[PDB]
């Protein structure tokens, strides 16, 4: 069978994410040979098969980046050995923590323009400090040097740095088989209306086991609706039951396109519940993190993002604080206008007109 794991590049803009991806395949293909629908790439180390997806490192193109970050069980941080860590480098990492991403491997790209050794130690220290701050095992995170461009054509030396990297893919990243054994849960990515079949919603199974023929519990944005699972199909082929970690579709006999919408949660009848007012910790992004530039107060009306949907909520900070600055991280209460399914231990994010505001976890639900 040979187990396979979804991975992908990640990091600051044009540090060399795509060119590394080209390098990894080209090298692994000329070396050996013998669950993702987005524009991806595939290569095989003698240990595992790998489903790799490149993401753009621009601050604006964090759209399919987060989508990709969710699916990958391991991220390949691309940091320029020259420029070093940049806002998006740490932007991606923190977002990585919020959106799963079990493990992380760093690739010091563009290492062919660094003669000064002391400069290599500085960026490695700075990088390793970043993910150590954003709740990632930085102090013992594999950081591989070398170049992607020089590894692309010829150079058995720079090609070895790629094989080295891919070696850590098998070494550092373990088998992410652990997922189910808990109540079912799934976010909605899109709502389609087929004239022959009916109405099939999409989305990756976050956790739990879904079998064709069971009930559901549509929770989110509007009312707590309930239907029945008519069938589950992947890509184009059918499916008997269903396994978590994969991304499929579920039809609902009686529910059409106008009845259900993107961002809701399908779960086991009596597990998760919708809320508008919640308790949270909330970190706040700074300038070096590509976040807020000016401080805000108790009159803030931004755009909150939960799972696949986004809600507009207010603020309510504890009696003792009156201002939040780009870099703060104080626990507080937010009241949303739309009820969204949540529980104790949900990582979300806040955004407002390009500038990605901070992100925190949900302490306890309320109303």
């Amino acid at each position: 069978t040979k187990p396979h794991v979804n991975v992908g590049t990640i990091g600051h803009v044009d540090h060399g994410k795509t060119t590394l991806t080209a390098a990894i395949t080209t090298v692994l293909a000329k070396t050996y040979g013998g669950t993702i629908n987005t524009s991806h790439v595939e290569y095989d180390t003698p240990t595992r098969h790998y489903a790799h997806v490149d993401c753009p490192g621009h601050a604006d193109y964090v759209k399919n980046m987060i989508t990709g970050a969710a699916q990958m069980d391991g991220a390949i941080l691309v940091v320029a050995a020259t420029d070093g860590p940049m806002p998006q480098t740490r932007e991606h990492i923190l977002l990585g923590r919020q959106v799963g991403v079990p493990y992380i491997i760093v690739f010091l790209n563009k290492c062919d323009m660094v003669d000064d050794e002391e400069l290599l130690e500085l960026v490695e220290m700075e990088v390793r400090e970043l993910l150590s701050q954003y709740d990632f095992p930085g102090d013992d995170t594999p950081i591989v040097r070398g170049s992607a461009l020089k590894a692309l054509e010829g150079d058995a030396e720079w090609e070895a740095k790629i094989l080295e990297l891919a070696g850590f893919l098998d070494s550092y990243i373990p088998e992410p088989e652990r997922a189910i054994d808990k109540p079912f849960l799934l976010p909605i990515e899109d709502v389609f209306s087929i004239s022959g079949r009916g109405t099939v919603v999409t989305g990756r199974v976050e956790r739990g086991i879904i079998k064709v023929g069971e009930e559901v519990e549509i929770v989110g944005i509007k009312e707590t609706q309930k239907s029945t699972c008519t069938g589950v199909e992947m890509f184009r082929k059918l499916l008997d039951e269903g396994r978590a970690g994969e991304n499929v579709g579920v039809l609902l006999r009686g529910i059409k396109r106008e009845e259900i919408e993107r961002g809701q949660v399908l779960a086991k009848p009596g597990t998760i519940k919708p809320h508008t007012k919640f308790e949270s910790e909330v970190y706040i992004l700074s300038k070096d993190e590509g976040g807020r530039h000016t401080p805000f107060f108790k009159g803030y009306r931004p755009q909150f993002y939960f799972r696949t949907t986004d809600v507009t909520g207010t603020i309510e900070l504890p009696e003792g604080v009156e201002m939040v600055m780009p870099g703060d991280n104080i626990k507080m209460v937010v009241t949303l206008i739309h009820p969204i399914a949540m529980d104790d231990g949900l990582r979300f994010a806040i955004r407002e007109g390009g500038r990605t505001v901070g992100a925190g976890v949900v302490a306890k639900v309320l109303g």
């Binding site: 050995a81 020259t82 420029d83 070093g84 860590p85 940049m86 323009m113 660094v114 000064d116 002391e118 400069l119 130690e121 500085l122 960026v123 700075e126 300038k287 070096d288 000016t294 401080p295 107060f297 009156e322 201002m323 600055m325 703060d328």
Partner: protein
């Protein structure tokens, strides 16, 4: 006196970007940081962002108001836990309480006075503790604001009530000022900044709008020229016309910075 590791390190710490780019621009300045910073801004590749001497240490900032005399200080500890063990956090108050009552602007006096309890606390907590600096501010109506433990701020005025003096302190802690009005800006600062804006290159028709960018900069480094934080739709030099007042002085303390008179 050439290129060291800690040299290019700090330059980036006050730049925000370009690791290897720093050393390249630094070696062009033959080792001088401020010359490099000028050249980097005049290169049209730096969004200013000059943070003067970022020490990036860890400690506490405490303040205490007392009618006309207000004393603020900085006490550097070790880990973030040391700053919140309530023993050292109260120790700093002990230093503050005797500093305010003694009205000390000479930090060396506080050193010897509390060197006894310092070593006694250091040996008890196992953490190296030090009192960095302390300054004072005289004014009619004082007001302080403790934005956490890292940042504190003292603001004195004449005419603003008990609430108005606090809201101004929050702005000082937020939008880091450096002067009151655009008028009281040192010509040494203006001229050296003038060479930066002027070196950005229309002939003799873009020079006049560049000197106009100075007028936006003078409001940016000031406080009356700076826009409010609670409502940036208006400045501040038009906000002292509320209860008819005027700011006397400003003091901003952050764990780090310094090395400047």
């Amino acid at each position: 006196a050439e290129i060291t590791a800690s040299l290019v390190k700090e330059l980036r710490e006050r730049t925000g970007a370009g690791m290897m780019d720093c050393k390249k621009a630094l070696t062009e300045a033959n080792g001088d940081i401020e010359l490099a910073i000028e050249n980097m801004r005049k290169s049209g590749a730096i969004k200013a962002a000059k943070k003067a001497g970022n020490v990036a240490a860890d400690g506490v900032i405490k303040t205490k108001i007392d009618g006309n005399y207000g004393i603020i200080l900085e006490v550097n500890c070790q880990t973030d836990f040391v700053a919140k063990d309530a023993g050292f956090q109260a120790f700093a108050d002990k230093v503050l309480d005797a500093a305010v009552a003694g009205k000390i602007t000479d930090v060396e006096v506080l050193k010897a006075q509390f060197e006894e309890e310092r070593v006694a606390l250091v040996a008890k907590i196992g953490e190296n503790i030090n009192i960095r600096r302390v300054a004072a501010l005289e004014g009619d109506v004082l007001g302080s604001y403790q934005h956490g433990a890292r940042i504190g701020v003292l603001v004195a005025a004449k005419g603003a009530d008990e609430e108005l003096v606090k809201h101004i302190a929050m702005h000082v802690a937020a939008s880091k000022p450096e002067f009151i009005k655009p008028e009281d800006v040192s010509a040494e600062v203006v001229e050296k900044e003038y060479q930066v804006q002027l070196d950005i290159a229309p002939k003799e028709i873009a020079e006049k709008m560049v000197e106009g960018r100075m007028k936006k900069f003078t409001g940016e480094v000031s406080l009356t020229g700076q826009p409010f934080v609670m409502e940036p739709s208006k400045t501040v030099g038009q906000l002292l016309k509320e209860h008819n007042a005027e700011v006397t002085g400003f003091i901003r303390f952050e764990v780090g910075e310094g090395i400047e008179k």
